[PDB]
């Protein structure tokens, strides 16, 4: 068929009509970002020749490409370590969650470290690790930061986020009861603190339900970590392709160097060695170039991940869709085998209602504009509310300001303004 | 068929018509039944606190269980010449697998940072009473040297 | 080693050029690394065979160097895009992004030149001398719940004040800096107090 | 379409698969770039008459 771009709808746009939500949704979405890849070291002399002195002699008379390839691979490994350090080792102190989990009904046991010691990983981290499944001079250099240390970094970041908000990302951590932290975050997205202080129980229940939906999605729905799996698969495919190319004839009489040496005279043996060296060296050049390109891509992804950690996790971001769809509230990091997972907690408007607006109010031959919010009328009664939530208030001189007469404003209506 | 490696008793079962056995990469693995496993090899790294600070060095053999050949064993391999201390310091020379070295040469596990527990409780906040103006230096390359190479002159001359 | 990044960039470039020069004087499987001796010693068929071999080797070396230069140029371009962005919203303005231009609340920045790069001196605000106070989500007065317009309600043990979030400026609770949004029967943590009406 | 090329390339290796995989990955990446840049919404809104 021809793919459909999405649902087709027409929005009722009028010069005196607005739609304001009367309810909200706390939605938790998951974002996957690769942070690093496997550190592979290739010994060029061992790969091309395989501990044969004569092939090594012909290689060293050929040139110094081996040093260049080793330097490139070493630089790739150090870049991977730096990527891991920059994404994870950001906070200079390891914060510990207090034993009394009094977060005003906001459950966090699914992302907090489990006291039962499952390698000091949260239950979500355990599912993330379990969901992804991971001789010729080819070695795998272990990462500098172990999985437990990465988990401890994530736990410290998460504990600092809960117990201090964004204060610990800008200096010394300052304790906050985590309810006024949510009130501050609501203030950041344009919602007054009264919404939280009226619907705290509902907000906590919705947040726990969203975490549970993430629980079910990670438990049942597979292929949720497609990016990390794709990175691992590409690296494994490239390595396997190099391994397969090790046993190519390249125009020689045999792909086994030892067989050539034990069968053929030194002049013809060395010309066959030259052919094999040319082929294997070209294959290694191709592999190193692809590895460098992939390392650059992974470095860009890790820079993006570090920016997301610093902006979404250590604070509240006003950037649209940078930390999840909707008005971003907070983010929680979770460790992944070769990357990171961001649980973005966001505010989504819902349950909308029609209203009639007016730019200003003409009262006593004067134009009154709202300080913050918008003028809305249901039926024949006029009120002022806030943009992101329907909280009507009586129009009063305190929350409105006067600017000129009501002759130049287009769309102004006649209404009374209460003077207290 | 000539080669270098270690001959080992094989638990795999061959067939009367089969003589050689090759695993992935189409390389010889088992020969008639004896398994061929090449002897241990790997890289050699040197850990030094710099020539001026000291003339002492430690040797790290990566991916080699060097019990066959101050000895420490880590997931990154084995280390010779360093005394294992059970303290926790900031990493100075990154060895790998959460293990670093610092200056006698000692090897330890990385200290992730100062550990403190925020005094988190309801109806309690921490508010600063003073300010600090801090100037932080950040360095970013903007450009590099523009080099032009004439291939005709370079290759031929 | 304060300017270690620029030093690393120029060292990498110098190493690449030095490696190219060294590879120029490599045998590449021929009889000699010099071409004039090949001309003066061999007959035209063997001479052109050795010249072809040297051309192939040097062409491979030059392509390797060019590819490395292209990768490094892409990285430097990314770094320069980052630097231009940092200049754009940290020198030409104030950035609300966390840790983009310094550890702490960024105030302003100063750019300075460098031989092949730029250096930003980020002036940032860092809180210090933290003190512990007793808080409440709202204040109950005349059967009504009062919330601060901006800031937070704190208590020093006996009296309740309202201050700002990033600094301690305690002020008496007043109807001017507080707003009423309901009663005291729904707010968790409500604390009874009086609000001065001027 | 010469059999000698196939004969001399089957022993040369599997570079053709590498190049095809690289080009396929590039093509998939461009499709993803367009998809990410242009499909920021899932509803096709229409301007009122
Ligand atoms: C908002 O939705 C929740 C259920 O999601 C419901 O319990 C609540 O009453 C709604 N709010 C209003 C004002 O109707
Ligand atoms: C949080 O959820 C876990 C299991 O999902 C439960 O054991 C725990 O009691 C919950 N905490 C609170 C405060 O409800
Ligand atoms: C309210 O708005 C919706 C969509 O914005 C529209 O379909 C509906 O007709 C409106 N209702 C009234 C009474 O205008
Ligand atoms: C409009 O809504 C307000 C709610 O504040 C209510 O007091 C008023 O009666 C409503 N007017 C009409 C005409 O429904
Ligand atoms: C909206 O447009 C209509 C024309 O259909 C006009 O009669 C009306 O005065 C306009 N109202 C405002 C507030 O602009
Ligand atoms: C508002 O009232 C004034 C005075 O009664 C009148 O002149 C004007 O036409 C009214 N405006 C509207 C929009 O009804
Ligand atoms: C170490 O540094 C000192 C002074 O900085 C210098 O004289 C010496 O050359 C360096 N290395 C050696 C060989 O000690
Ligand atoms: C080395 O081998 C011994 C026994 O052969 C084993 O106990 C030890 O775990 C190995 N060391 C490592 C981690 O390589
Ligand atoms: C740490 O290591 C030392 C020496 O390796 C050993 O005595 C013991 O396992 C640990 N010592 C202490 C005091 O924990
Ligand atoms: C704040 O610190 C400065 C020095 O940085 C000092 O002069 C001043 O007395 C301090 N203020 C308070 C209230 O302690
Ligand atoms: C009191 O303040 C200190 C520093 O001012 C802070 O670190 C601590 O969390 C606070 N709470 C206590 C000690 O209960
Ligand atoms: C709190 O401060 C007020 C005035 O700032 C003072 O009257 C009162 O004694 C203080 N109480 C304590 C416990 O410090
Ligand atoms: C704080 O929590 C304790 C129990 O942990 C409770 O007794 C107290 O009433 C709470 N105070 C406020 C202001 O929420
Ligand atoms: C606040 O005062 C009202 C009446 O004056 C009383 O019913 C209520 O229990 C008081 N609350 C507290 C926390 O003292």
Curated annotation (Swiss-Prot), chain D:
- Relate the protein's function as given in its record: Precursor of the fusion protein processed in the biosynthesis of the S protein and the formation of virus particle. Mediates fusion of the virion and cellular membranes by functioning as a class I viral fusion protein. Contains two viral fusion peptides that are unmasked after cleavage. The S2/S2' cleavage occurs during virus entry at the cell membrane by host TMPRSS2 or during endocytosis by host CSTL.
The protein, known as: Spike protein S2
- What lineage, starting at the top, does this entry show? Viruses, Riboviria, Orthornavirae, Pisuviricota, Pisoniviricetes
Q: Which gene encodes it?
A: S
- Mapped onto the parent protein, the portion here is 745 to 793 of 1273
């Amino acid at each position: 068929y021809t793919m459909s771009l999405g649902a087709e709808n027409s929005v009722a746009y009028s010069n005196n009509s607005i739609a304001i939500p009367t309810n909200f949704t706390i939605s938790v979405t998951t974002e996957i970002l690769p942070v690093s890849m496997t550190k592979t070291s290739v010994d060029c002399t061992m790969y091309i020749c395989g501990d044969s002195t004569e092939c090594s002699n012909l290689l060293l008379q050929y040139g110094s490409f081996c040093t260049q390839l080793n330097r490139a691979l070493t630089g790739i490994a150090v870049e991977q370590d730096k990527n891991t350090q920059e994404v994870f080792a950001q906070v200079k102190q390891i914060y510990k969650t207090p034993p009394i989990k009094d977060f005003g009904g906001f459950n966090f046991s699914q992302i907090l470290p489990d006291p039962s010691k499952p390698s000091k990983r949260s239950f979500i981290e355990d599912l993330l690790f379990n969901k992804v499944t991971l001789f010729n001079g080819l070695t795998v250099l272990p990462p500098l930061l172990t999985d437990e240390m990465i988990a401890q970094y994530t736990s410290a970041l998460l504990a600092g986020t809960i117990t201090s908000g964004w204060t610990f990302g800008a200096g010394a951590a300052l304790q906050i009861p985590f309810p006024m932290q949510m009130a501050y975050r609501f203030n950041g997205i344009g919602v007054t603190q009264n919404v939280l202080y009226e619907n705290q129980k509902l907000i906590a229940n919705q947040f726990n339900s969203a975490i549970g939906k993430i629980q079910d999605s990670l438990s049942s729905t597979a292929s949720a970590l497609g990016k990390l799996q794709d990175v691992v698969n590409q690296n494994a495919q490239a390595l396997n392709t190099l391994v397969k190319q090790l046993s190519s004839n390249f125009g020689a009489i045999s792909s086994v160097l030892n067989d050539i040496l034990s069968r053929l005279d030194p002049p013809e043996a060395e010309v066959q060695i030259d052919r094999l060296i040319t082929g294997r060296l070209q294959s290694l050049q191709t592999y190193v170039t692809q590895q460098l390109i992939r390392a650059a891509e992974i470095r860009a992804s890790a820079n993006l991940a570090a920016t997301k950690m610093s902006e979404c996790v250590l604070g509240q971001s006003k950037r649209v869709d940078f930390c999840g769809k909707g008005y971003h509230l907070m983010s929680f990091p979770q460790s992944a085998p070769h990357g990171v997972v961001f649980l973005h907690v966001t505010y989504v408007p819902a349950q909308e209602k029609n209203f009639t607006t007016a730019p200003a109010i003409c009262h006593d031959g004067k134009a009154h504009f709202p300080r913050e919010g918008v003028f809305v009328s249901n039926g024949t009664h006029w009120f002022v509310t806030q943009r992101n939530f329907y909280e009507p208030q009586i129009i009063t001189t305190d929350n409105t300001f006067v600017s000129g007469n009501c002759d130049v404003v287009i769309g102004i209506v006649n209404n009374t303004v209460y003077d207290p | 068929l000539t080669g270098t490696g270690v001959l080992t008793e094989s638990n795999k079962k061959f067939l009367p018509f089969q003589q050689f056995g090759r695993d992935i990469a189409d390389t010889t693995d088992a020969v008639r039944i004896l398994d061929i496993t090449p002897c241990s090899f790997g890289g050699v790294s040197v850990i030094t606190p710099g020539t001026n600070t000291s003339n002492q060095v430690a040797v790290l053999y990566q991916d080699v269980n060097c019990t066959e050949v101050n000895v420490f064993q880590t997931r990154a391999g084995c280390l010779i010449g360093a005394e294992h201390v059970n303290n926790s310091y900031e990493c100075d020379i990154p060895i790998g697998a959460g293990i670093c070295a610092s200056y006698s040469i000692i090897a330890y596990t990385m200290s992730l940072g100062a550990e403190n527990s925020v005094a988190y409780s309801n109806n309690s906040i921490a508010i600063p009473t003073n300010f600090t103006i801090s100037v932080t230096t950040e360095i970013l390359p903007v450009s590099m040297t523009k080099t032009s190479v004439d291939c005709t002159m370079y290759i031929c001359g």
